[PDB]
Structures are given as structure tokens and as C-alpha cells.
Amino acid sequence: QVQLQESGPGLVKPSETLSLTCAVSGGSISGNYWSWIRQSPGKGLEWIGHINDYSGRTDYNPSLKSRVTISTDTSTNQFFLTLSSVSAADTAVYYCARRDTDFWRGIYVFEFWGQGVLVTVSSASTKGPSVFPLAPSSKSTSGGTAALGCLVKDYFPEPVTVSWNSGALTSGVHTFPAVLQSSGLYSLSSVVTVPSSSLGTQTYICNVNHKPSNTKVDKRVEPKS
Amino acid sequence: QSVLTQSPSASASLGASVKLTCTLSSGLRSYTIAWYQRQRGQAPRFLLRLDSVGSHTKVDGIPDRFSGSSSGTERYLTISNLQSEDEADYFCQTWTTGIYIFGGGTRLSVLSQPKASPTVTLFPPSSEELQANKATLVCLISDFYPGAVTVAWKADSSPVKAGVETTTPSKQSNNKYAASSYLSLTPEQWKSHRSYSCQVTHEGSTVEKTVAPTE
């Protein structure tokens, strides 16, 4: 039946304009209610608006009306969204969709959806990480072992690479996925589980490489005295 | 005050049945709703419409194990004989004079292997970070299944919500999940309390780790 696919930039700077395209196939020649919907983190879905491509007329969510434009290009089977003057509140997964025209028992529904595209409103620029040692602790590890690590804080964009002892230490290493913070910067942690008996003699260094900023840090992680 | 209320999460194992509830505000008590499914990385799928007396519209391509029923202000989606692919966000929706109202969605986990409880590792701020006039508590959560947790932080015994950043769970190489949560403090806040705690809730059970600045 109807297939939909969103595309467009994944990042937009605050106060600038977000633009998205939807490519469709299997729609009607005329009379489609091409729609946009979004979902922000922690919130429910929110309708943005639609255009009917027989009448050419639009309907928008009143809270967004001043900032939204929806339009079509029938000749290339596409329709479009623009959202001006964006702020952090506009970070969301954006969906294109097609509304039904059955009005069964007084409801309209979205019969077909695209897979959605994440757009993040971000003022972040290339920035190297601060690297802090996470001194060894055996409180949460199995008998005879201790966990130690490095906190790789406030960098942009992804990725960072973390190795241990220049790649000689790979067993027991868990580098966690980064969190994207509200600041627009990433932070992650890399932890390695090692023998507690080794803490007095074996040196542990985390090697952090942030290729986007050409920053490298080799941080010794020492036991607390 | 048109509101559709759904519980945020639910879990069940393969082959079981589950009933998800959408509760309609009193002004919407006679309204028709639609149910949708959103599987991870997939387009949302329209599942069915369901009116106040319990009639529904079956949708082409939707398995017969999805059905709907109604009772007063409540609208139900029942999924029988759960399959692994039924793990999804399920959300309800209605329409009121050109306004779309959505529920918040229920994230249903469908267990296809046994529950695994999380390991929780909590690190205090490093002395180096405190010297840089910052302080981050690091709560690392690993080896849990299904991939659904909530994290609560406490200062001494009081909940703390500001300064908290938590990842969505991500699948590890061993098919269990990992997540991390970070609490940002000032050095003065860190040194002034007796302790801070990271509490992880997973499938009803809780694990709480605590760190004290005097350590």
C-alpha cells in the first residue's frame, strides 16, 4: 500500500529552521492528507499538521502555526515540513504519515507512517573530552577482582575510542555507550575489571582518542590511599 | 482536560497474554480510540479502531492475536500468544474537533529468555574532577534483561532529580542490556551530604548502591 520515508538533517542550530522531506509511493493521484507528527523524549506524540493535495490547503497545530509550513511536490512524490525558530523543545523524532478519510465512529487515524527521523536542536561544536580516573573499587565486583575506569566527559561529536594499556589489556573491558546530555555534549565511561592482587604492581592507563578534535589523553588510574 | 492515560511499561513472556489499558478522561468517555504499535527502529503501525461499545475495525496485515474491547472510560488492547516481535511501544489516540489526543504509550517488554538482574557499580567524583570545580557521580548498570530500567538518585535520603542524565538501555554482545546514569553536583553539594545513592528498579526489584564523601 502506501509507503513513506522521511529524510533531512539530524542537527539544527537554535533559532534556525528545520526542514524535512517525505518520499511517498502508493498514494492516491489526488486527495491525500499528508501529515507530520513528532515525539519528544519523555513526552507523547504531537500532531504538527497536514496538507490535502486535492485542495492544496493546510491545517496546523495552533501551538505551532506561526512556525510551520507544509507543502507538496506531486511531480516527485514528495512532501515537506519546515519549522522555523527552533529551540530545545523541538528536539524530537519526526514522522510523516497519511491520515485516513473513513471517519469511522468519529475518529481520524494515521493509517500509514514512515520510520521517523531524529532531529536534535544543538549548538554544540567540536570539543575534546575531559578525562577523569575512576579509582578501583571492589564493592560490586566478584571475589578477588576490582573495577576501575575512566570517565570521558563533555565531548562532541562522536566517537571517542578508549583502550587500556595501549591495547595490551582487553579482557574485562566494558566501554559503555555515551549519554547525549542536555548541553548537547556526550559523556561515557569505560571500566575494566582486574585482579585485586594486581592493584599494587600493575599500572593501568586509559588511552582516550577523540579524532574529531584531535585530542588524546593517557590517564593513569591509581588506587586511592 | 482531554487526556488519555496509559501506564508507562509492562512485561510478559512468550506465549502469554497481556491486556493494555487506555483510560479516557470523563469528557471523552464515549469516544472512539485507535491503537498503534511502534517496534524499535520500525514505522508505527495502525492496529485497530475501537469504539465505546467495543466494536472494532480489523486492519489488513495485523495478526489476529491483537484485539480490542471497551468498558466505560477504559479501552483495552489484548495481545494473546505473545511473540518476540510484539515487544513495542503501544499508544492510543483519539480525535476531538480537529485536535489529536495521544496517550503516553506503554512500553511492553516480551521476554524470550529468562530475566537477568542488573549489576550496579557506583563511582564517586574523582579528586581530580573536584579540583576542576565539578563533580559527577557515575552509576553503571549492566547484564540485565529485559532492557527496561528506571533510576532514582538520592541525596542522603531525599530524591534528587536535577542534574541527572540517563541513557536508554543498549544491548550488549551477550544479549543482555547496559545503561548508565550520571548525577552532576557542585563540589560543595558533594562534600556537604552524608551520602548519595543510585537506586535501580528492574522488573519490580530494586538494587541501591551508596557512596559517602568521607570515604
Residue numbers in the entry:
A (entry chain H): 1 to 52, 52A, 53 to 82, 82A, 82B, 82C, 83 to 100, 100A, ...
B (entry chain L): 1 to 9, 11 to 27, 27A, 28 to 52, 52A, 52B, 52C, 52D, ...
How did the manuscript describe this experimental structure?
HIV-1 Env is a homotrimer of gp120-gp41 heterodimers that mediates fusion of the host and viral membrane bilayers to allow entry of viral RNA into the host cell cytoplasm. We characterize Ab1303 and Ab1573, heterologously-neutralizing CD4-binding site (CD4bs) antibodies, isolated from sequentially-immunized macaques. Ab1303/Ab1573 binding is observed only when Env trimers are not constrained in the closed, prefusion conformation. Fab-Env cryo-EM structures show that both antibodies recognize the CD4bs on Env trimer with an ‘occluded-open’ conformation between closed, as targeted by bNAbs, and fully-open, as recognized by CD4.
As compared with a library screen that would not preserve correct heavy chain-light chain pairing, Ab1303 and Ab1573 were isolated by single cell cloning from SOSIP-binding B cells derived from sequentially-immunized non-human primates (NHPs). Ab1303 sequences were derived from rhesus macaque germline V gene segments IGHV4-160*01 and IGLV4-97*01 gene segments for heavy and light chains, respectively, and exhibited 8.3% and 8% amino acid changes due to somatic hypermutations, respectively. We found that Ab1303 neutralized 12 of the 19 cross-clade strain panel with IC50 values < 100 μg/mL, whereas Ab1573 neutralized five strains in the panel with IC50 values < 100 μg/mL19. Although the neutralization potencies were generally weak, both mAbs exhibited heterologous neutralization, with Ab1303 neutralizing >60% of the viruses in the cross-clade panel when evaluated at high concentrations. To further explore the interactions of Ab1303 and Ab1573 with Env trimer, we solved 1.51 Å and 2.50 Å crystal structures of unbound Ab1303 and Ab1573 Fabs and single-particle cryo-EM structures of BG505 SOSIP.664 complexed with Ab1303 and Ab1573 to resolutions of 4.0 Å and 4.1 Å, respectively. For both antibodies, there were no major structural changes between their free (solved by X-ray crystallography) and bound (solved by cryo-EM) forms: Root mean square deviations, rmsds, for superimposition of free and bound Ab1303 VH and VL (235 Cα atoms) were 0.72 Å, and 0.89 Å for superimposition of free and bound Ab1573 VH and VL (231 Cα atoms), with minimal differences in the complementarity determining region (CDR) loops. Thus, Ab1303 and Ab1573 bound their Env antigen targets using preformed antibody combining sites, rather than undergoing structural rearrangements to accommodate their targets. Similar to the results for b12, Ab1303 and Ab1573 did not bind BG505 that was captured by PGT145, suggesting that the closed Env trimer occludes epitopes for Ab1303 and Ab1573.
